[PDB]
Write a protein that binds this ligand. Structure first.
Ligand SMILES: Cc1nc([C@](C)(O)CO)sc1-c1cnc(N)c(O[C@H](C)c2cc(F)ccc2N2NC=CN2)c1
Length: 291
């Protein structure tokens, strides 16, 4: 059986909390293995392992269960348990009713029928929440490798929403091909040398900040992966999202410094997000309204 190390402790599949299969009920599909909304009552998201899978798929599934179960932070999705002693195997997560951040931004964009559905403060609160999760990973020497809007979840659709990092698939893989690496979220030393440090997540966080303030656009509009690689290697950076306040765009450009040592750590990023949150010239800026 495979082992896993985090925050000074080694853990094994015996440490995972096995939930009796009879206590688990599936309600509906959420998306793709398949993920279901379920109940244990506790509302859960059920990640399934296909019964027809390779031995490497099984080890990856067991590793992601160990990774998420060992985290303890308000901005990282909770693991309620697993159901590994029955087929198909399950990983049971905290059900984040707000869904994924990329879909939430796309669906909650201000429109004429709702011109204030989202404000600069909502986006700053999401950014702070994920930066708090990243700071926890940084201080525990865990490198995420795929900080992106698609990998973040929201507790609810409303103003009290809390954003959390919900996927650890890329980190699990490293603990396969070029066209699958998230090159649009990677710093130059990562896509060129395969060097990953805490400063890799800083660069990716800058890209997530762009995704958030653009309200869910795909980074580097109209550029392919090779074009992005050539652009970023040459010193090219994204333009500010539409109506993005200068102090927020400044955080993105600091996250995208070519030298990893010139990028801020997450403590500095949180200080800057907090300053943006306090600045009336920032939070009083209206987001664009999509006709
Ligand atoms: C309730 C809910 N609604 C979602 C939609 C369908 O994407 C709409 O936002 S995700 C979601 C949803 C809610 N809570 C979860 N714990 C969850 O975990 C799954 C494994 C997940 C975690 C992520 F970090 C990113 C994507 C996904 N999904 N999403 C689709 C397949 N895996 C998904």
């Amino acid at each position: 059986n495979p082992n896993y190390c985090f925050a000074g402790k080694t853990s094994s599949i015996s440490d995972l909390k096995e939930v009796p299969r009879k206590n688990i009920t599936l309600i509906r599909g959420l998306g793709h293995g398949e993920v279901y909304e379920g109940q244990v009552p506790l509302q859960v998201a059920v990640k399934t392992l296909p019964e027809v899978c390779s031995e490497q798929d099984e080890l990856d599934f067991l590793m992601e269960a160990l990774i998420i179960s060992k985290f303890n932070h308000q901005n990282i999705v909770r693991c309620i348990g697993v159901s590994l002693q029955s087929l198909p195997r399950f990983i049971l997560l905290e059900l984040m009713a707000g869904g994924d951040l990329k879909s939430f931004l796309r669906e909650t964009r201000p429109r004429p029928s709702q011109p204030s559905s989202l404000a600069m403060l909502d986006l700053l609160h999401v950014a702070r929440d994920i930066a708090c999760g990243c700071q926890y990973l940084e201080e525990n020497h865990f490198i995420h490798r795929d900080i992106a809007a698609r990998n973040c979840l929201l507790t609810c659709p409303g103003p009290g929403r809390v954003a959390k990092i919900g996927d650890f698939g890329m980190a699990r893989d490293i603990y396969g091909g070029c066209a699958m690496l998230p090159v649009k979220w990677m710093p130059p030393e990562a896509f060129m040398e395969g060097i990953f440090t805490s400063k890799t997540d800083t660069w990716s966080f800058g890209v997530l900040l762009w995704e958030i303030f653009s309200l869910g656009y795909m980074p580097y509009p109209s550029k392919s992966n090779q074009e992005v690689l050539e652009f970023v290697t040459s010193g090219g950076r994204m333009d500010p999202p539409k109506n993005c306040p200068g102090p927020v765009y400044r955080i993105m450009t600091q996250c995208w410094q070519h030298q990893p040592e010139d990028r801020p750590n997450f403590a500095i990023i949180l200080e800057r997000i907090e300053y943006c949150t306090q600045d009336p010239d920032v939070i009083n800026t209206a987001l664009p309204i999509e006709y």
